[PDB]
Ligand binder design. Structure first.
Ligand SMILES: O=S(O)c1ccccc1-c1ccccc1
Length: 344
């Protein structure tokens, strides 16, 4: 069987099972989304599509635009090097030092931080979701400033380009695929340039990108990766029709991901390498961006703790008016598959 797919620049068992051959053994082959069909990464508008990535796009799709297109198969928390980075030679060493400083943030993050979404509700799915992706920077800045007893009104918000948030339709359509290596090439190099421009004092970085940025001679004012309140819940979705019509296929898919997740625990280097190749980053940055032992946490989850993390992100979206009505996670989830896999 053939399924179209994609994954965000996050640790996940779908990519792992695919690259390690577990899916092939299960008689499943995945075809990654081309840049020309890239919007599906945000819209889920395909009959046999599966994605494992950030939770914001699917939450918006299910809760704001097209309820019912997907079912949730599992969750894999994400937490690693994260925060507002400054050059090593910057006199800024504590959160309090950010007072009155120039914080580079995406236009999307500025809308959220200002509490002024503008035309948000009128935007097409792609641009609309990109506004919501400004949430990473927004929450990170709020948490960071709390450390110095500061608020958003105590700093200068300066518009800059942020990876994954600023993705023009032309860039997407011109990209070979939605793999990080194609869509997000040399992120750290670009962020290092912003910090060297003399017009910004700090900017937000995370994922392996933060690992490579750090290597250029930069550091986070506050490493948000050290506090779980900065974690996100990567979600694994599949077209709802497959769940209802081809449960056998979905079960084989989930079984393969679980086996791949178990296998990953004893093949850390291979898992690091396949993620590094997929994202187009150094192998060392993967561990920094996802956590040193992320390979031990690849078996998908649907336990209450995992669902609570997903709910936490959903609440940030609701509070900030990015979502008006919440997605019923228990209804969205299709726990029977993962449950059957773990009971083998
Ligand atoms: O949750 S998202 O998939 C996501 C999560 C983390 C980093 C990048 C992206 C992304 C943004 C735009 C297009 C493709 C990926």
């Amino acid at each position: 069987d053939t399924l179209t797919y994609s994954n965000s620049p996050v640790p996940n068992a779908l990519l792992t099972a695919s690259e390690s051959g577990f899916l092939d053994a299960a008689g499943i082959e995945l075809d990654v989304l081309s840049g020309q069909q890239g919007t599906v990464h945000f819209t889920y508008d395909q009959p046999a599509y599966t994605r494992f990535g950030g939770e914001i796009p699917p939450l918006l799709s299910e809760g704001l635009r097209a309820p019912g297109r997907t079912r949730l198969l599992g969750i894999t928390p994400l937490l690693g090097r994260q925060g507002f980075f400054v050059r090593d030679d910057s006199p800024i060493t504590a959160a309090a030092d950010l007072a009155g400083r120039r914080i580079g943030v995406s236009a999307s993050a500025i809308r959220i931080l200002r509490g002024q979404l503008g035309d948000y509700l009128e935007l097409d799915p792609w641009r609309q979701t990109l506004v919501a992706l400004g949430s990473w920077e927004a929450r990170a800045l709020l948490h960071t400033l709390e450390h110095g007893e500061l608020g958003v009104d105590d700093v200068e918000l300066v518009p800059i380009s942020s990876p994954g948030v600023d993705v023009p339709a032309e860039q997407l359509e011109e990209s070979a695929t939605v793999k990080g290596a194609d869509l997000f090439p040399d992120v750290a190099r670009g962020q290092a340039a912003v910090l060297a421009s003399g017009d910004v004092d700090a900017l937000y970085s995370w994922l392996p990108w933060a690992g490579e940025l750090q290597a250029t001679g930069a550091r986070p004012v506050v490493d948000l990766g050290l506090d779980e309140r900065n974690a996100y819940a990567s979600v694994w979705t599949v077209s709802s029709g497959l769940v209802r019509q081809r449960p056998g296929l979905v079960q084989r898919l989930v079984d393969a991901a679980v086996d791949a997740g178990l296998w990953a625990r004893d093949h850390s280097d291979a898992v690091t390498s396949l993620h590094a190749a997929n994202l187009g980053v150094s192998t060392g940055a993967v561990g920094q961006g996802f956590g040193a032992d992320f390979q031990q946490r690849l078996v998908p989850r649907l336990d209450h703790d995992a669902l609570a993390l997903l709910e936490r992100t959903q609440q940030f979206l609701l509070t900030n008016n990015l979502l008006q009505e919440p997605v019923a996670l228990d209804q969205w989830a299709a726990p029977e598959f993962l449950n059957n896999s773990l009971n083998r």
